[PDB]
Ligand binder design. Structure first.
Ligand SMILES: CC(C)=CCC/C(C)=C\Cc1c(O)c(Cl)c(C)c(C=O)c1O
Ligand SMILES: CC(C)=CCC/C(C)=C\Cc1c(O)c(Cl)c(C)c(C=O)c1O
Ligand SMILES: [Fe+3]
Ligand SMILES: [Fe+3]
Ligand SMILES: [Fe+3]
Ligand SMILES: [Fe+3]
Ligand SMILES: [O-]
Ligand SMILES: [O-]
Lengths: 264, 264
């Protein structure tokens, strides 16, 4: 019931106290739809860099991972649920920046040039949302201290600034950078799953949060392992989508149809 | 068919030449759904300013309209389809900025503070999209010259800069400003409809563009008058949504549930 009578009211501020906080409202209705036994065989891939921009994007991603794993100490001592959840918590904050700056920029460009966007913007905005829901999930499993909360704030200031100027200069670099980020994300999350299957990691967070159970349409029997599986699948999708988008830029197809709008 | 095999491919760049340019792909699948005879009675309203911020927002909107109508010469000589389409073309470029900066900012905040957004972001992003589709529609009816294209570019540079810093400082001001913008938009578009009904404006663009016919689920018998009706309805929705959001800020409910997620 949304008609002229509601459109003619000044404010619905009076209604806020009587509307429930439902977990399904945290996202849009564009939810991933994975089948566990299929996404089980998501694999680790690597796209060869074409030239200088692609090499720059990859060297910057690899430099970032080597810094990050060494400073965060992921490498030494055994894997644990605590360092896994902690790691992902941090990185998922950054993860939702690229698609939002990308979509914002293609949006602005569509408006100032009065051009069609042909399905790109929505794909990058939903990507951004997807990563944000990754974050919403992990913060149900672990609430960070002040040091990590302060680091997250300053890391956002830097990555937003970087991603914004980089996308204005070279959308190709950004899409490729993201592509390469998701290559590493798929590696990390398959390391998580492998350590679970090998008993090196005995996860205890096996009451998958409600936010995630409705977002990924997971049953109440889904476990931590299943949740990481669907997150990893999401990452692989971003991996392909972004390398594809970078390729299109490389070929001067940035004003062509988003091929994923149909492949749907 | 979207599974592990596709998630494991490096790029779908090879598929781009075989995917069709469909007008339904220009937006997301979150389309307005208006009934013409109901939205016919959308009306002109005015929200009373609360205090200094609200007065500032309204005085700035009214100052902008008085400047704009006088410089653009909307006022003198008769109304025509040419000046109507022209006007809307220009203003719809600005129109899609606010919701995108708003949604981008609530998104970033959700990520750095690891908080829930509770349905706000999606509402502002779809708003931004909606306005952009207003623009996509009007540019099917009229293609602008260079002077107006240069003015659109520089107007975006200024309004984006304004809206970005204003939203960081006072989301309340921005939401209220938008609320007041849409008050004027609803006035303008009801002036258009009234001039049509009174024969002062005999519109010739009565083959509603395909982009708009699928976006608003309009029949092939829909006319220019019907298209303005649905655009006006969209504006009225933004009018309420934004005044509501401003009110929530005014009451420190900015971290409460988006009431419109349910009112749906
Ligand atoms: C951007 C930055 C400061 C660090 C990224 C760390 C990196 C280059 C690779 C590992 C990695 C990860 O290990 C995980 Cl868990 C995720 C979710 C992502 C997401 O992009 C990811 O990139
Ligand atoms: C923001 C700016 C430079 C001008 C806005 C003009 C104004 C204050 C009022 C009239 C008006 C309009 O006349 C029309 Cl047609 C639209 C679509 C809008 C949308 O916001 C609108 O505000
Ligand atoms: Fe992620
Ligand atoms: Fe990711
Ligand atoms: Fe509009
Ligand atoms: Fe508007
Ligand atoms: O990620
Ligand atoms: O508008």
């Amino acid at each position: 019931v949304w008609g002229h009578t509601q459109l003619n009211r000044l404010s619905f501020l009076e209604t806020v106290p009587v509307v429930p906080l439902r977990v399904s409202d945290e996202s849009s209705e564009d939810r991933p739809t994975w089948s566990l036994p299929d996404i089980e065989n998501v694999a680790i891939t690597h796209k060869k860099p074409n030239g200088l921009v692609d090499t720059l994007a990859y060297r910057s991603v690899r430099t970032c991972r080597w810094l990050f794993d060494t400073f965060s100490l992921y490498r030494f001592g055994s894997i644990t649920e605590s360092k896994v959840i902690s790691r992902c918590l941090f990185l998922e904050t950054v993860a939702g920046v690229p698609g939002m700056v990308g979509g914002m920029l293609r949006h602005l460009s569509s408006l100032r040039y009065m051009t069609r966007d042909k399905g790109w913007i929505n794909t990058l905005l939903v990507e951004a949302e997807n990563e944000r829901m990754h974050l919403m999930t992990f913060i149900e499993l672990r609430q960070p201290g002040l040091p990590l909360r302060v680091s997250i704030i300053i890391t956002q200031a830097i990555m937003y600034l970087f991603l914004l100027v980089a996308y204005v200069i070279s959308p190709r670099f950004v899409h490729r950078f993201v592509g390469y980020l998701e290559e590493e994300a798929v590696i990390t999350y398959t390391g998580v799953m492998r350590a679970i299957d090998e008993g090196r990691l005995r996860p205890t967070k096996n009451d998958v949060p409600e936010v995630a159970r409705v977002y990924w349409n997971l049953s109440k029997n889904a476990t931590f392992r299943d949740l990481i599986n669907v997150i990893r699948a999401d990452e692989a999708e971003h991996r392909v989508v972004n390398h594809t988008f970078a390729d299109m830029h490389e070929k001067r197809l940035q004003n062509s149809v988003n091929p994923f709008v149909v492949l749907k």
